[PDB]
Structures are given as structure tokens and as C-alpha cells.
């Protein structure tokens, strides 16, 4: 129960995430977007604010429960993959010691941003180093953990070949279905599905992540009746709300908003490419490109 490292996957997670959920859309994203891309913490407004908070977050360098920097995951984060990133002890040192002078004083976003400002502007490419933030960085570190959920594969289809691994054929094995067969692979693909699109983790279900999802696909007028299902939901693992969902009368979006995300969670881009969802059928030809030399 130390913390833990951040992988490749994890660390592409926070980035993408944080871009949809803070980067403006139409005329004005392109000089937020050219600036963050660039790892510039620019310009310092209300936008940036909030957007740094949420990276600062997701790669839990920022802790909201204590309201502090977490200086001493710096070290943590750099000895998991050192191999790797070759990156420098003595700097790995230097920003441990400028972040412990940090102060988050309320941990509201402004505050968060103006502490975090400075370091950042001293460590931001040792930073990228550390928490995977370079695309060939990112790319090495993928290469030397085939173990975890690669670029263009998605949750449903890395979590269903880690379930099925043993004798017992994969009940997915012409395509995934949506059949509750009360199975332990299942409800082990199921566990993991869910907690890959970050709808469970081990504080329970995070309901708004799935309501998100119904959002995604152009139903949000249904998030009262998406939390009325899990609301009475009996039993609290994964399977169990995917059963609640799968047998409600929510079924045919809940699956189309599931479809979705399996590829989004292929494409950690996706939405940041000004794609946006259409229906089912072109989801299946996106989830087929992901199966091309190219890979779109």
C-alpha cells in the first residue's frame, strides 16, 4: 500500500482525459491546444488553472484528501522505469526538493497553478520524462510492458484475453457479447472492463462515469433513469451493474454507449480528433480500422 508508479497507459489516461474535459472547443482551442501540447502552462487564466489542477491530480503529484504536494512520489514514479527513461538522479533530486517548497494553500485551482508554475518551468522536460508525457518516451515504455493495454487495443478486448487464458474457451470467441452467463471469466472481464473506462476503482462505482458515457452518445436526457438502474442495484461488483444495465430497459444504449467506449478506449484520441459519436454501425467500421496497418 505504498503508492504506486504510474504505467504508460495510466499516465496516457490523465493526459487525454484532462483535454476533454478542459481544452476549448472551436476558434479558441488552437492557441490553448498549440500551447499545452507544448507542455506551456499558458496563458495564465481560469482555463489553464483548472486544467493544471486536473493533470496535477491524475498523475497524483497534487493529493485532494490531504491538499498537498506529493513530493515523495516524485522519486517513486523515476525508480519504477529508470532503466527506461535513463533520466538523471541528481535532477530527479532537485525537483523532489523544489516541489517539497511548493505551497498548495487552499488546493483551489488557482492556487495549485500559481505554486506549481515555477517548478514546472525548471522541470517540465525531466517532468515529461518521469510521468510519460513524450510520445517515443511513452512508446519505450509500452516495449517493455507488453503486459499492459496497448495503444489501438481496447479495454474489452485486453481484459477478454486476460480472462480466458485457460482451458475453458473464451465465450467472446466470435465477438464479444452481451450474454450474462454468471461465469467467473465473465464477471473477471467484466471487473476489469470496468475498472479500464474507469467506471469502478476500489472506493466503489463511480456512477458519473457511466452516466458520461451516455452523454458520449447523445442520451443524456436519460441520466436520471441511468441512476435510478445502478441505484437499485443488489450487489456491488462490476458484473453485478453491468447485469442491472444489460437487463433494464436502458439495454440497447447502455450497449451502444459500452460500444463506444470500447473504442475510445482503443483510441485514447478520439475525441480529441473532432470525432464524435454517429451510431453503431460507425463504430464497428472505426473498431475494424483499428485493425489495419495504419490503424485509422
Same mark, same amino acid.
Given at each position: ?38 507542455? #506551456? ?77 515555477? *517548478? ?90 457511466? *452516466? #458520461? ?13 441511468? #441512476? ?69
Amino acid at each position: 500500500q505504498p503508492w504506486k508508479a504510474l504505467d504508460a497507459e495510466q499516465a496516457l489516461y490523465v493526459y487525454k482525459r484532462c483535454y476533454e474535459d478542459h481544452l476549448p472547443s472551436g476558434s479558441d482551442r488552437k492557441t490553448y491546444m498549440t500551447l499545452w501540447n507544448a507542455w #506551456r502552462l499558458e496563458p495564465n487564466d481560469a482555463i489553464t488553472h483548472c486544467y493544471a489542477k486536473c493533470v496535477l491530480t491524475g498523475l497524483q503529484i497534487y493529493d485532494p484528501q490531504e491538499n498537498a504536494f506529493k513530493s515523495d512520489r516524485i522519486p517513486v514514479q523515476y525508480q519504477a522505469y529508470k532503466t527506461i527513461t535513463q533520466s538523471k538522479q541528481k535532477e530527479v533530486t532537485e525537483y523532489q526538493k523544489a516541489l517539497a517548497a511548493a505551497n498548495a494553500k487552499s488546493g483551489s485551482c488557482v492556487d495549485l497553478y500559481n505554486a506549481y508554475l515555477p *517548478v514546472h518551468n525548471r522541470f517540465v522536460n525531466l517532468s515529461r520524462q518521469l510521468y510519460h508525457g513524450t510520445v517515443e518516451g511513452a512508446a519505450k515504455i509500452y516495449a517493455a510492458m507488453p503486459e499492459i493495454k496497448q495503444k489501438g487495443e481496447s479495454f474489452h478486448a485486453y481484459c477478454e484475453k486476460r480472462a480466458w487464458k485457460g482451458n475453458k474457451q473464451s465465450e467472446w470467441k466470435n465477438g464479444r457479447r452481451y450474454k450474462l452467463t454468471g461465469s467467473p471469466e465473465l464477471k473477471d472481464a467484466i471487473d476489469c472492463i470496468f475498472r479500464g473506462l474507469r467506471y469502478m476503482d476500489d472506493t466503489g462505482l463511480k456512477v458519473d462515469e457511466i *452516466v #458520461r458515457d451516455f452523454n458520449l452518445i447523445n442520451k443524456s436526457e436519460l441520466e436520471p433513469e441511468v #441512476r435510478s438502474v445502478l441505484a437499485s442495484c443488489k450487489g456491488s461488483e462490476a458484473y453485478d451493474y453491468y447485469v442491472c444495465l444489460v437487463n433494464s430497459r436502458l439495454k440497447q444504449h447502455f450497449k451502444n454507449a459500452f460500444d463506444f467506449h470500447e473504442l475510445r478506449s482503443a483510441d485514447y484520441a478520439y475525441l480529441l480528433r473532432g470525432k464524435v459519436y454517429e451510431n453503431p454501425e460507425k463504430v464497428k467500421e472505426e473498431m475494424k480500422k483499428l485493425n489495419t496497418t495504419v490503424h485509422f
